Design a protein around this ligand. Structure first.
Ligand SMILES: Nc1nc2c(ncn2[C@@H]2O[C@H](COP(=O)(O)OP(=O)(O)OP(=O)(O)O)[C@@H](O)[C@H]2O)c(=O)[nH]1
Ligand SMILES: Nc1nc2c(ncn2[C@@H]2O[C@H](COP(=O)(O)OP(=O)(O)O)[C@@H](O)[C@H]2O)c(=O)[nH]1
Ligand SMILES: Nc1nc2c(ncn2[C@@H]2O[C@H](COP(=O)(O)OP(=O)(O)O)[C@@H](O)[C@H]2O)c(=O)[nH]1
Ligand SMILES: [Mg+2]
Lengths: 439, 262, 429, 48, 107, 49, 429
């Protein structure tokens, strides 16, 4: 019951998956060999691992994940890595030639020869799950594989599994830092897929994580490893409600309807607090109100998008640890009284509170410190129009005279696809502006 | 501590919390139960001819798990059939009152079996039905080991490969009869009046079910530690038409005061 | 009033083995034949199913018969392999191949002689035979064809005796044979002509019972065999034990069979509780009646609302007053008059045995001649016509010397019986 | 008047047919007393 | 000679696995009497007496005065049905041969 | 059954949780009292010396 | 006589199972179900909330209902959770997803058949039930939607039987759900047309009592439900126990429902005190009455001062003199005649129950049909209309199956009853 299938598209998706999977193994007490020690103190076994792990008659736990990537380096290195025994030898699909940061290549030429096998693996994952809650797809649309193959995979999931919940944790391009010149092209081309066949999309820009870890952890040079640790922490906080009992347990579809006001509006920011180093973890009193204020602080956010430029439409607060339904209520009331953040007029309540009794775990060798309580955000707000207004402006700047478009044309994509995605993003501007407009 | 806020009210709340409570009692009860179960018992030795005897405490040991048959007095069930006390196999060092058992004769013989001699009145013979009773000190009522038919609601405590064996005070009954036989089913046709030797490896059958006692070495964690599942049913490596070939070590037993299986 | 039983085919062999399991449990008979009961009530009527030897050993009055030798080679390894007579094991070199034709005409014929020999042994060994019981499956070749041949010879030899038939009606939801409709059609009319009254089981109905009533995951055929064996043991409870309102097989047939052809019944046991709900439920006669008339407890894949009960019989067991067991079923008739038939006042017949099954304060076995029994026969006939229109899997049957016209005769018998049931369901006074 | 109780006291341990009780006894503790030494297969009370 | 995946995603020992997961917080619930009690919580008394039983009694045998009827800590002494029920539903525990008794009743 | 097994696991985990919290409170109180007594006797010894 | 209870949603399930602990404590029942009461006062009416099994265990007449397997596992989280019958545990694979439409129309409706089956079985088990009880919260989807769905068939099948529902109405201060106004608006009209009387529970006032009336430092939901359990025990204390002045569900309804549409009650408990000051409060009827009528003690988050009491009821418990149990009500009426409507003289239904909860000297439950229920209904309806004007979150409901204008009908059924309470708030003779 409550099984969730994890999909990792692209290199960024694969590494985020590695981080979240070591976090899941740490939480559920699973060694890299795939086994779970017998809890002799209690005498009967947990079923919390069922949502992410499938039991084998030999007692080994197989993760419910599919690593789909068009180039073999990362997946082969995982096969050589520590969790080789843990991970299924299949469902770890390797392509032969990379998409080369081409949405057209990942969606029209190399996508078809691997999407059939990817869907076969997805079916072998789903038919095992008798209570499949939904799919969580970790990817970065900035690249070629994560954009094109991700869009194709979303197409097939939407057309074959009906209205199953989909959670697209997408790493969008940041305002200044980016590792590609065609990255805005890939992003704007993939916005159509992430708008049509993505039930809830979560923003995972890189500069926000970079500066958050720089100033909060007091660490000069953390890396992709640390940002993936934060992403795994966020996803674990989101998904812990159905794994560990709490005062208020919210499932994926439980908070999906509270998050999404309109079908076209499902792009959400996220944040996490306290993201605190060990040195100053034991000096501050990290109360529920304190961590809620830290979450609502625009700086303390995992997405680089200032909410004060927009208005909150629906906030979901996932608390873990020794929080109490009245401390969360008091924090909510005090912050409603506080005025520097604006809530949209047609959503008076605008707040969802989930509570879990499981304090967040700490990855050995990581940067997060042992804290008694924490809280994560899934916030749907009108401020997200800003990042789209940056990305489509960049796309127009490069598309005024067709930079890097011969590569897409030669891969079987019509020239009109770019324009189509352009007015798709324009409509995604207009609907957000309309819902943010006062009645 | 600091008197900020409702310190007086918190102090009264705490004080009346301990007053109403007045954990430690549960731990003391657990330790008392362990001591009562593990109170050592003296089992009779082998005397004169090495034949097993009746009305004497003994240790029943399996040849596969190397453990001894034990019963945990708590963790019971009250079914319409009566009391249901779970029994298992445990690795024991000394003959504790928890894991020791006594054999007593049963009422009805084979009706084909021979009249046992006067001198061998106190000696258990092959195929002679007997009840397995817990020793006096475990509990002031007698507990009898008996199995029952495998039904939709009847099976081993965790697995379902074998039947449900248990200790219950419903003795002097058809279900409570257990008969003894040698290690070879082929040789258990001519030795039926002969006395059973103690030192040899041996096998237990339940009369009603015609199934041998066995333990799968499947660990379930009981309040005394990690016990091995115990049940009834013939286990064979090959699921042939008739089975009954080389008996699996699950079904082999031993009733020696001195010596242990490997 | 001895009842002598036979088990045909491997399905019949297993069902009869666990039937004897239940019977030996009730009568206190050890697998080696020794009587080890507690009171004299068990020993008073132990002769109906067992006969004593010179040494006092009790031997079941059972005939084990099947063309496939492995089933009776393996049943000797069961708990009661040594309980039955060594000479009552009648095996052939090869199985019927799920072929009714060669199980009834070629391989059965050369072995039905020995089967009749052993059956006559058991029949003449008793002072007054009460019935010939036979447990088999109609979807096979050896259980259906050779079993029906045995029924024919037994009816010819003993026309005035009860012919107990426990026939496992196969269903396509749990179909594991393709000549299923052929064998069912070729055996059902033989059952109609040569059996006074039948007693029919569905594997899928038993699966539904173990799913939604007992709440159990994955056991083997042993659970279905246990439930059917409980019904088989309970149908003769009044014969085997005293009670306030005794009954026998002939009385049940008289009270349940208004017309000679209409003799197919669906069965239900009560009470049935989950593994952890026996002591959460109060065993009462009202609950027993509710379970009897509940569909999920019916051991037959027929919806009782689609049909109407020609008759019903309730073999209750246990100490209890008669008014709350007979007025209760009068009340259920009053509330469900639409589910019963007007021209038979009080379709319900009640019998009380005074010895309930071990572990249960009170219980009951339900029998029903509902007109909804025609659903399975409609399904079997539709499948039979679908298969027979294209002459599929028919060369196997025609190569055993069995005539072409016999299939059409079986079809005609099916249509006739379905028409009888429908025209008695919709009949008006 | 406890009918079931007095039944357990007397009827359950009563013997109706001592012939049958001796011939095929179950878990019965009553009526097993038969002729003392009357039945020896040797046919004579003398030692074998 | 090493990769970032090897350097960061290292192997984990059993102690590290055990210590990574922290024991979850336990919600604290006040006891029923603690939330709703008045007087001495150490000695909780009962007031299961009937006004009709106290006021209406054989006056010659025993009399209860008015204020005693209005307030008095105790439990009613009418317990015939309860005694019958306990009798029906009759330090190592006792396990009577109720199964054998039930079998004898059945037979 | 799965439902009863999971519920019974919840039983024992909650019971263990309660015991752990209870003796954590006891050990806090015991540590406080031990510190108090230790420093009282230390002050007495200091004055005597 | 007996009252069969049903629990819906996480809130309702936890509250009801926490209440069953109070009931078993009052009736002297261990978690194993055996009876340990020291007097027949706890046994003569144990059939009101329990039914006996074969072994003497008293199973509650509780129908647990939700859509979360985890909620079914954690409803019995209390020490007395094993007491429930396992078969009554009914749940769906997928939860309501905080959706009234999903809980009411498609996914919760496919299970309401089994809900009605088990409820009808339990109702027919007893002699004749006096009424139904429900415990649910309108904030959630499965508690509100499918709870209203259930009470629909309950009212249809039993039109002349009492329908008590303890409905938790969340407040915007304590709100933790955005579709909460939608669920409340869609469920209130069902409560209006489906329940003869229904008191409202607000977590805001519950917390207010737990903060500055109990003066507790950290009460969670478990301690929060204690007030609700106490009051919904005192509602039927007179049914389950004797008294100088008996009462029952219809006793309360006929005295607290002047008009059919006016059956929403704000209600509370007494005595309440801080754990720092029990030994200083002199327990007396005057103190009880003083703590009944003040705004803070009542567990609804709208003070009675802005409304005029249509009527009120005082279910006292414990051996107390009848003079001051009612002259206190007289005195409060005469000193606050401005707070009571003039056209209904003596607005207070006073009733006395003989046996208070054990460990409590005396208690009283206050249930008032005051007109400031319009306050909660306005504070939820304004949110509903504000969030409905811009089509917010309506796409989930419309895709799930409900019509667009059904919400307009629900808002109309909000507004008409709000106006109904208004036009009696300031009524003149
Ligand atoms: N947060 C985070 N972002 C990453 C990580 N790895 C890569 N990215 C970002 O994701 C963007 C797109 O991914 P790519 O570098 O194109 O790799 P890909 O997704 O497999 O696509 P291809 O290059 O076609 O294989 C890059 O520009 C990176 O900035 C990571 O581990 N964590
Ligand atoms: N209840 C039960 N049904 C069985 C068993 N064995 C077979 N069957 C049923 O019998 C049908 C097959 O009939 P089969 O045994 O081949 O007939 P036979 O060869 O003439 O004995 C299948 O549909 C099974 O469901 C059994 O042990 N128990
Ligand atoms: N008093 C009380 N309120 C509760 C409890 N559990 C949940 N709630 C309230 O119920 C609301 C959410 O209801 P929800 O759990 O979604 O209802 P469901 O979907 O029907 O199970 C929250 O606003 C809580 O205030 C409880 O144990 N006690
Ligand atoms: Mg790449």
């Amino acid at each position: 019951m409550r099984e969730a299938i994890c999909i990792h598209i692209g290199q960024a998706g694969c590494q985020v998956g590695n981080a979240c999977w070591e976090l899941f193994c740490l939480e559920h007490g699973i060694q890299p060999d795939g086994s779970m020690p017998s809890d002799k103190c209690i005498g009967v076994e947990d079923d919390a691992f069922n949502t992410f792990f499938s039991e084998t008659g030999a007692g080994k736990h197989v993760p419910r994940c599919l690593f789909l990537d068009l180039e073999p380096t990362v997946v082969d290195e995982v096969r050589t890595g520590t969790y080789r025994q843990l991970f299924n030898p299949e469902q770890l699909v390797s392509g032969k030639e990379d998409a080369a940061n081409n949405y057209a290549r990942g969606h029209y030429t190399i996508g078809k020869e691997i999407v059939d096998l990817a869907l076969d693996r997805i079916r072998k994952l789903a038919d095992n799950c008798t209570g499949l809650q939904g799919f969580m797809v970790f990817h970065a649309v900035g690249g070629g594989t994560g954009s094109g193959l991700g869009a194709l995979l979303l197409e097939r999931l939407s057309v074959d599994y009906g209205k199953k919940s989909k959670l697209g944790y997408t790493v969008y391009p940041s305002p200044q830092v980016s590792t590609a010149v065609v990255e805005p092209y890939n992003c704007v081309l993939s916005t159509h897929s992430l708008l049509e066949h993505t039930d809830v999309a979560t923003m995972l820009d890189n500069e926000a994580i970079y500066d958050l870890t720089r100033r909060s952890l007091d660490i000069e040079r953390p890396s992709y490893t640390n940002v993936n640790r934060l992403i795994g922490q966020v996803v674990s906080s989101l998904t812990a409600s159905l794994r560990f009992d709490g005062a208020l347990n919210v499932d994926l579809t439980e908070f999906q309807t509270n998050l999404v006001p309109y079908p076209r509006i499902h792009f959400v920011l996220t944040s996490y607090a306290p993201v605190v180093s060990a040195e100053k973890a034991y000096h501050e009193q990290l109360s529920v109100a304190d961590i809620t204020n830290s979450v609502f602080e625009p700086a303390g956010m995992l997405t680089k998008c200032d909410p004060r430029h927009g208005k909150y439409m629906s906030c979901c607060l996932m608390y873990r640890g020794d929080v109490v339904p009245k401390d969360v209520n008091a924090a909510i009331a005090t912050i409603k009284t506080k005025r520097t953040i604006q809530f949209v007029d047609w959503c008076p309540t605008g707040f969802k509170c989930g509570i879990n009794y499981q304090p967040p775990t700490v990855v050995p060798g990581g940067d997060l410190a042992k804290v008694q309580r924490a809280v994560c955000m899934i916030a749907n707000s009108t401020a997200i129009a800003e990042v789209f207004a940056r990305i489509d402006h960049k796309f127009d700047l490069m598309y005024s005279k067709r930079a890097f478009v011969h590569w897409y044309v030669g891969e079987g994509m019509e020239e009109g696809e770019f324009s189509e995605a352009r007015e798709d993003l324009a409509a995604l501007e207009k609907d957000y502006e309309e819902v943010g407009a006062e009645s | 501590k600091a008197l900020l806020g409702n310190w007086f009210e918190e102090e009264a709340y705490e004080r009346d919390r301990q007053r109403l409570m007045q954990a430690s009692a549960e731990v003391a009860h657990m330790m008392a139960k362990i001591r009562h179960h593990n109170a050592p018992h003296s089992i009779a030795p082998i005397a004169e001819d090495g034949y097993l005897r009746f009305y004497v405490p003994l240790m029943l040991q399996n040849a596969h798990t190397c453990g001894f048959l034990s019963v945990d007095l708590d963790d019971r069930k009250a079914t319409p059939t009566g009391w249901q006390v779970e029994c298992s196999t445990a690795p024991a060092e000394e003959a504790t009152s928890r894991c020791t058992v006594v054999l007593t004769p049963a009422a009805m013989p084979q009706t084909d079996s021979f009249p046992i001699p006067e001198d061998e009145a106190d000696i258990v013979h092959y195929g002679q039905p007997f009840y397995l009773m817990t020793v006096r000190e475990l509990c002031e009522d007698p507990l009898f080991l008996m199995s029952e038919f495998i039904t939709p609601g009847c099976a081993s405590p965790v697995t379902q490969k074998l039947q449900h064996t248990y200790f219950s005070p419903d003795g002097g009954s058809a279900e409570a009869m257990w008969c003894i036989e040698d290690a070879n089913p082929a040789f258990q046709e001519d030795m039926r009046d002969h006395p059973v030797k103690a030192d040899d490896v041996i096998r237990i059958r339940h009369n009603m079910t015609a199934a041998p006692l066995a333990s799968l070495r499947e660990v379930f964690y009981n309040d005394f530690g990690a016990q091995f599942e115990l049940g009834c049913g013939r286990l064979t490596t090959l699921a042939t038409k008739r089975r009954g070939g080389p008996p699996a070590l699950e079904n082999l037993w031993m009733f020696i005061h001195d010596g242990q299986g490997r | 009033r001895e009842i002598v039983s036979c088990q045909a085919g491997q399905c019949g062999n297993q069902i009869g083995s666990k039937f004897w399991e239940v019977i030996s449990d009730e009568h206190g008979v050890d697998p080696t034949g020794t009587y080890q009961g507690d009171s004299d009530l068990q020993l008073e009527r132990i002769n109906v199913y067992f006969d004593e030897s010179s040494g006092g050993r009790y031997v079941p009055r059972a005939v084990l018969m099947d063309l496939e030798p492995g089933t009776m080679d393996s049943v000797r390894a069961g708990p009661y392999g040594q309980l039955f007579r060594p000479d009552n094991f009648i095996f052939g070199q090869s199985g019927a191949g799920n072929n009714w034709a060669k199980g009834h005409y070629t391989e059965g014929a050369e072995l039905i002689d020995s089967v009749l020999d052993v059956c006559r042994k058991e029949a003449e060994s008793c002072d007054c035979l009460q019935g010939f019981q036979l447990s088999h499956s109609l979807g096979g070749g050896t259980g259906s064809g050779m079993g029906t041949l045995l029924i024919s010879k037994l009816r010819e030899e003993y026309p005035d005796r009860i012919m107990m038939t426990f026939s496992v009606i196969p269903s396509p939801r749990v179909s594991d044979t393709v000549v299923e409709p052929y064998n069912t059609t070729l055996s059902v009319h033989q059952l109609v002509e040569n059996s006074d009254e039948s007693m029919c089981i569905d594997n899928e109905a038993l699966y539904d019972i173990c799913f939604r009533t007992l709440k159990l995951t994955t056991p083997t055929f042993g659970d279905l065999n246990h439930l059917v064996a409980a019904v088989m043991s309970g149908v003769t409870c009044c014969l085997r034990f005293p009670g306030q309102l005794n009954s026998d097989l002939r009385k049940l047939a008289v009270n349940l069979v208004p017309f000679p052809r209409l003799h197919f019944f669906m069965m239900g046991f009560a009470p049935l509780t989950s593994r952890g709900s026996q002591q959460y439920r109060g065993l009462s006669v009202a609950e027993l009646t509710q379970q009897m008339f509940d569909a999920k407890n019916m051991m037959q894949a027929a919806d009782p609302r689609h049909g109407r009960y020609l008759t019903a019989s309730a073999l209750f067991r246990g100490r209890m007053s008669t008014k709350e067991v007979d007025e209760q079923m009068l009340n259920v008739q009053n509330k469900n008059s639409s589910y019963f038939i007007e021209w038979i006042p009080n379709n319900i017949k009640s019998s009380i045995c005074d010895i309930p099954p071990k572990g249960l304060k009170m219980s009951v076995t339900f029998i029903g001649n509902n007109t909804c029994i025609q659903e399975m026969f409609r399904r079997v006939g539709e499948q039979f016509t679908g298969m027979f229109r294209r002459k599929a899997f028919l060369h196997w049957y025609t190569g055993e010397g069995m005539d072409e016209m016999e299939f059409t005769e079986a079809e005609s018998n099916m249509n006739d019986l379905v028409s009888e049931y429908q025209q008695y369901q919709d009949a008006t006074v | 008047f406890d009918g079931e109780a007095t039944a357990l006291e007397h009827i359950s341990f009563d013997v109706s047919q001592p012939e049958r009780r001796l011939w095929q006894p179950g878990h019965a503790t009553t009526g097993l007393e038969g002729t003392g030494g009357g039945s020896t297969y040797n046919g004579v009370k003398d030692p074998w | 000679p090493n990769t970032t995946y090897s350097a960061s995603y290292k192997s984990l020992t059993e102690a590290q696995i055990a210590e990574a997961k922290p024991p979850g917080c336990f919600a604290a619930e006040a006891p029923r009497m603690l939330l709703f009690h008045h007087g001495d919580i150490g000695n909780i008394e009962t007031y299961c007496y009937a006004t009709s039983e106290l006021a209406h009694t054989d006056r010659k045998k025993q009399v209860y005065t008015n204020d005693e009827v209005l307030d008095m800590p105790g439990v009613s002494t009418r317990r015939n049905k309860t005694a019958a029920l306990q009798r029906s539903t009759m330090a190592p525990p006792r396990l009577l041969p109720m199964g054998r008794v039930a079998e004898r009743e059945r037979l | 059954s799965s439902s009863e097994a999971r519920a019974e696991r919840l039983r024992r985990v909650n019971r263990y949780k309660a015991i752990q919290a209870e003796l954590a409170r006891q050990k806090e109180e015991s540590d406080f009292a031990a510190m108090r007594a230790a420093k009282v006797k230390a002050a007495a010894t200091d004055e005597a010396l």
